[PDB]
């Protein structure tokens, strides 16, 4: 079934010390998260660049890692129910706060952790190139060769287009209907590895280190080993839901060229351009497209999705 | 009287060609904006860094200009009525679009142009160090020594704390009352040069290059000398107003140390800390504090303000 | 069905500034071209080299990119009807001229845009290496395993043999019959990815910036933002059709070794050599064989082709 | 059927002279070992690193080869009956001792040669990427598509997780049952190439150069061309079996990322974590996980295994 998604977002200094702490503390945070039975997996991304849209963002390119002074992370965790995320943070707060607080020396912005519902998903399980023979064998044995997926390789061996959209109030249904029609056509582009549409339902104050006064002072004054009062979060998840309504259109691709020309199909192929124009008419903001590398992940999230 | 404020925000590559285009294009844009009789002035900022709050943003410093790969600009224009902003943009679209388009080669994000009402202002006129003798003489000559301002030096000779806040729905009045009480106390800190509170009322689609499908394709396809259809903006300014409600607390300071310890007064001086705690209890997001240099400005906006 | 093909040809300086403008302006031109509902896609090439044919062109090699002072581009656009190409240019001339004129600073020769009919096509859809599993599954589910194509990878991951031929007047049928027999045999060569035969039907004067006197002056005097009169083209497409008749034999290959030995099959395999000798007897000029890299492309042209 | 496994373990200087000895001596030893009809194959490994378990072994990483002063080898030989290994050594002692002695100059620790029974195996035959087309063909031809294996590439083109465990006396059955459940679930991880559990039954004194006094003096005094008395081994294989009982859990993976996150599935996927917790409760020692590269091998051992 469709899980809910929490996306923890932050911007950190682009230096070895940051990647060192990703490698030490990141696994620990994931192990802590996995203590909760409602956790169904994760997909952790680094932003490598920004899609330039010709020269609309002429200062950007799809891979800016060499030049950029910062690194943005977008850490997706998947949950049977979004309340499971809120419970896990609170049940495991002494570990999680002290783990996440160790990233402080490297932080420039964040953490900020919006929560989403998945309103559309066309996403395969991941497979390594070594796996495909057995997958094909099994699908033919089951008499379902139509269910043989594309090869979507895990652990940094594909790329993601993370397309931000905010929608005019009243135009949500028009956006949702048109984006799904768009993505159903998009899937014909070479190197398409799957797509999903995330609709924001709110924000996790605790995941965002956003407390009332007491907890704010506790964060600022922390030696690193003392939890802020987790009951000093002043707002529930839905209270922070944005209007204009926010969506992420998340599309996965074999490589950055497939991403550039494949996402470009919505502009270059007249039939699809006409459908996608119905999306564009509904927007307050976007599409703004970040190029992400899914590096560290728990691929069983897709197994849950496709149950 | 209080003007409305439009703040055009963008992120560009941090390199010489960018600052060269600020020098070419920026003055031209301001001159075009001044064709409208409702224009009352401008204050254009570059972000120099981010307030670290001890080590909460431990990768940040107040001056990050030597290491950052990007530069963020925040261009304030002041208007008798916010509709004047919208009218100026449409009436001068040929010039403005083609001027702003020249910046595309350097752009990474933006433009994004929220519009604000000023709900509180304690801001002086600017004066150079050479002016103060005549100001003092003139105020004493008219029997108004209370109207002698601090010396708030124009053109890059002071610094701004730009503090972003978003507020729990329903707590807008509590925030507003609390922040004004806070700023009325803050004005005792040494080096304090004034403060104002901006409350978002909406977003200029045209200023943000956010059109429907027709205008989006015109933007992406543009050789630089053809206008997108300015009538293809699909939402009004208020239709884009965010909930949670967004505010900017804008506080000016003599220098960055005065800024750090001055804004710090709300954490360090117990009586003020108690008042400011009432602000903190209302927030969804923030305070996140950008450090800005007001470089290019039309100082007469303050003359209008203080009329 | 078989579309028509326009091939825009030019030679430019082989320097970064040329490739910078390909990345900036190329996409804009494609987006403009896609405004016409008769546009069915595109395949844009850079010439990497020339086939030496032993040492017949002993100064050449298949990859000359490191040494060459120029770069030749051959931009294929595909059209339901060739008249569509002519309408598209006229209907969108404001944008298109101004975009293409921005290439001026780098141009040495061109543009020159002959138009072709396809008289023979054996060309597959493109697929990425990730896609093949699903393609195989679908064709078996459909009971059409015979229709499983080779893997012809998009976006610079294969090579093209572009073989120019001109034919003795009166021998066009003999050429056409012999070249098809030849290509039907050539498809056995390892790494063969498809072939088509293009027969020239004329030249687009507008696409070649070839006007009467009035438009010629307008081109030469242009500051960059003023279109020449698109109605000052003095000849229709068919009026410029060459005699001797020109053809392109376009053959795609997995890599340059497969290209060299595979194309060489017409010389090395006696049974094929006998068939291809019938082609050679009909020529005025050729075969002259350029080695091309298909970098930017709209792969959906093959979908139209194969319906 | 399941063979028995002898694992010869040694630590040598990490310098070129060592790898030169591997290249000349190693193939000779394997040829001698092949003189016995009970020899069913071999798989020889170098340790490339150690799994850090987050930062539990924070000084380790998966590939330590550039920094390490030593190199550990783990040479697996597979035997129809374990007694065959013992007989082979005695029958071929003049050659083997003299061959193994020539490694002396490079040795820091070892040799040490425990013998194992295989209590669980899910291991495929190895195939090169060239082979898979024919394997698929044959399996479909015999109506067994379910038996198409993953592609497990020989000769250094995959990696091995070598997980050491020692088990509380009396908890052997619990460990064995829970480890099998764990590996049956682990096989769903991307990149999984097979697993087996080895249970120690004893140690080969002769393979370990572990003699009584007579043979010890002979080894120490050896010019290189005189055998120690092979009848001076003082203990049988089972007499050296350890309590606490030792096991190796040997898991093969496409690459080190698949190994890291895949082995990690036992910590990150809640359903598998619960199962693996049952293994963890049984341990005296471990899991301690060496990362191995299987470079030189006699792949036919898996053919024997899978008959
Ligand atoms: Fe979270
Ligand atoms: Fe504006
Ligand atoms: Fe053309
Ligand atoms: Fe042995």
Phi-psi region of D109 (alpha: psi -120 to 50; beta: other; left: phi over 0): beta
A-interface mutation test, from B19, B166, B214, B216, most A Cβ less than 10 A away:
B216
Neighbours of B38 (CB within 10 A): 16
End-to-end CA distance of chain B: 6
Neighbours of D1 (CB within 10 A): 9
Cβ neighbours for D73, distance < 8 A, ≥ 6 positions apart: D8, D9, D10, D11, D12, D22, D44, D45, D46, D47
Residues 198-257 (B) with a CB less than 8 A from some CB of C: 217, 220-226
Side-chain-facing half-sphere of B36: CA atoms under 13 Å:
27
Pair of tokens at residue D262: 């895949």
Neighbours of B128 (CB within 10 A): 12
Cβ neighbours for B16, distance < 8 A, ≥ 6 positions apart: none
Dihedral sign of CA atoms A133, A139, A141, A144 in order: negative
Place of tokens 């048109």: A178
Q: Which residues of chain A are within 8 Å of residue D264 when distances are taken between CB atoms?
A: 27, 298
Is residue D232 exposed (0-12), middle (13-18) or buried (19+ Cβ within 10 Å)?
Answer: middle
What is the distance between the alpha carbons of residues D75 and D282, in angstroms, rounded to a whole number? 28
Q: How far does the CA of residue A165 sit from the closest CA of chain C (Å)?
A: 21
Pair of tokens at residue B56: 């909460």
Residues D208 and D112: beta-carbon distance below 8 Å: yes
What is the distance between the alpha carbons of residues A42 and A3, in angstroms, rounded to a whole number? 11
Query: Could you give the number of structural domains in chain B?
Result: 1
B13, B203, B216 ranked by CB distance to A280: nearest: B216
Q: Pick the ligand that lies closest to the CA of residue B32.
A: 2
C-alpha B204 to ligand 2 mean position (Å): 7
Pair of tokens at residue A258: 């497939």
Q: Pick the ligand that lies closest to the CA of residue A9.
A: 1
Residues B95 and B25: beta-carbon distance below 8 Å: no
Strands (DSSP E) contained in B148-236 are 159-167, 192-203
Please name the chains neighbouring A, where neighbouring means 3+ C-beta pairs under 8 angstroms: B, C, D
Q: D188 — contact with chain A (CB < 8 Å)?
A: yes
Residues C135 and C127: beta-carbon distance below 8 Å: yes
Residues B50 and B163: beta-carbon distance below 8 Å: no
Q: Pick the ligand that lies closest to the CA of residue A203.
A: 1
Place of tokens 């030469």: C220
What is the distance between the alpha carbons of residues A210 and D119, in angstroms, rounded to a whole number? 53
What is the distance between the alpha carbons of residues A295 and A297, in angstroms, rounded to a whole number? 6
Q: A157 — contact with chain C (CB < 8 Å)?
A: no
**Chain mean position to CA D282:** 22
DSSP letter at A168 equals -
Residue B113, marked binder = yes
Alpha-carbon torsion angle D5, D10, D11, D14, nearest 10: -80
C130, C137, C298 ranked by CB distance to A146: nearest: C137
What is the distance between the alpha carbons of residues B104 and C21, in angstroms, rounded to a whole number? 14
DSSP letter at B106 equals G
Q: Give helix D93-101 / helix D16-33 axis angle, nearest 10°.
A: 170
C-alpha C89 to ligand 3 mean position (Å): 7
Q: In a 3-state reduction of DSSP, which class is residue D238?
A: helix
Q: In a 3-state reduction of DSSP, which class is residue D25?
A: helix
Q: In a 3-state reduction of DSSP, which class is residue A77?
A: strand
Taking CA–CA distances from B49, the nearest residue in chain A reads A108
Residues C293 and C189: beta-carbon distance below 8 Å: no
Count of CB pairs separated by less than 8 Å, A with B: 140
Residues C292 and C162: beta-carbon distance below 8 Å: yes
CA separation, residue D136 to residues A141, B188, C130, D142, D151 (Å): 13, 81, 18, 10, 11
Q: Which residues of chain C are within 8 Å of residue B213 when distances are taken between CB atoms?
A: none
- Whether A106 sits inside 8 A of B267 (CB atoms) is no
Q: A104 — contact with chain B (CB < 8 Å)?
A: yes
Query: By C-alpha distance, which of C289, C295, C208 is closest to C19?
Result: C295
Strands (DSSP E) contained in chain B are 4-13, 39-50, 70-79, 107-112, 114-122, 159-167, 192-203, 245-253, 283-298
List the determination method.
X-ray
Query: By C-alpha distance, which of C296, C111, C273, C84 is closest to C206?
Result: C111
Domain span at residue D73? 1-307
- Whether A28 sits inside 8 A of D54 (CB atoms) is yes
Q: Which residues of chain D are within 8 Å of residue A129 when distances are taken between CB atoms?
A: 151, 254
Neighbours of B202 (CB within 10 A): 20
Residues B88 and B98: beta-carbon distance below 8 Å: no
DSSP C161-210: EEEEEEE-TT-HHHHHHHHHHHHHHHTTSTTEEEEEEEEEEEE-TTTTT-
Residues A43 and D190: beta-carbon distance below 8 Å: no
Residue A113, marked binder = yes
C-alpha A25 to ligand 1 mean position (Å): 15
- The kind and range of the H/E element at A220 are helix A213-220
Q: Which residues of chain C are within 8 Å of residue B221 when distances are taken between CB atoms?
A: 28, 31-32, 95, 99
PDB resolution in Å = 1.7
Q: At C110, phi and psi to the nearest 5?
A: 100, -175
What is the distance between the alpha carbons of residues C143 and C138, in angstroms, rounded to a whole number? 9
Query: By C-alpha distance, which of D167, D159, D153 is closest to D198?
Result: D167
C-alpha C87 to ligand 3 mean position (Å): 10
Q: How far does the CA of residue A268 sit from the closest CA of chain C (Å)?
A: 5
- Give the residues across from D75 on adjacent strands: D8, D44
Q: Alpha-carbon Rg of chain C, whole angstroms?
A: 20
Alpha-carbon torsion angle A68, A71, A72, A75, nearest 10: 150
Residues D113 and D204: beta-carbon distance below 8 Å: yes
- Whether A126 sits inside 8 A of D190 (CB atoms) is yes
End-to-end CA distance of chain D: 6
Residue A89, marked binder = yes
Buried b / exposed e along D127-164 (16+ C-beta atoms within 10 A)? beeeebeebbeebeeeeebeebbbbbbbeebbbbbbbe
Cβ neighbours for A23, distance < 8 A, ≥ 6 positions apart: none
Query: By C-alpha distance, which of D83, D50, D283 is closest to D172?
Result: D283
CA separation, residue C197 to residues C44, C80, C229, D220 (Å): 17, 17, 34, 80
Pair of tokens at residue A83: 């309340």
């Amino acid at each position: 079934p469709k899980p809910y998604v929490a996306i923890n977002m932050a911007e950190l200094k682009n230096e070895p010390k940051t990647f060192e702490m990703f490698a030490s503390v990141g696994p620990k945070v994931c192990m802590v998260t996995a203590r909760h039975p409602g956790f169904v997996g994760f997909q952790n991304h680094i932003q490598i660049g920004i899609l330039p849209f010709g020269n609309r963002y002429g200062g950007a390119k799809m891979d800016m890692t060499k030049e950029s002074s910062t690194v943005r992370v977008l850490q997706y965790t998947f949950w049977k129910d979004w309340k499971d995320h809120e419970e896990m943070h609170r049940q495991n707060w002494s570990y999680l706060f002290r783990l996440c607080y160790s990233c402080a020396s490297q932080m420039i912005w964040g953490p900020w952790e919006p929560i989403y519902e998945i309103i559309y998903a066309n996403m395969p399980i991941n497979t390594e190139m070594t796996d495909f023979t057995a997958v094909v064998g099994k699908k033919f044995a089951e008499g379902k060769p139509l269910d043989i997926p594309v090869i979507s390789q895990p652990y940094g061996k594909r790329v993601v287009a993370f397309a931000e959209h905010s929608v005019i109030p009243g135009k949500e249904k028009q956006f949702e209907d048109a984006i799904v029609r768009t993505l159903e056509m998009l899937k014909k582009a070479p190197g398409f590895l799957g797509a999903m549409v995330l609709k924001e339902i709110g924000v996790s104050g605790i995941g965002s280190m956003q407390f009332g006064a007491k907890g704010f002072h506790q964060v600022l004054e922390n030696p690193g080993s003392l939890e802020p009062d987790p009951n000093n979060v002043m707002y529930s998840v839905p209270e922070a839901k944005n209007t204009p309504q926010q969506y992420i259109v998340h599309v996965e691709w074999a490589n950055t060229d497939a991403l550039m020309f494949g996402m470009g199909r919505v502009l270059l192929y007249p039939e699809l351009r006409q459908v996608h124009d119905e999306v564009l008419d509904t927007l307050v903001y976007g599409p703004y497209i970040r190029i992400l590398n899914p590096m560290m992940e728990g691929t069983f999230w897709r197994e849950y999705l496709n149950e």
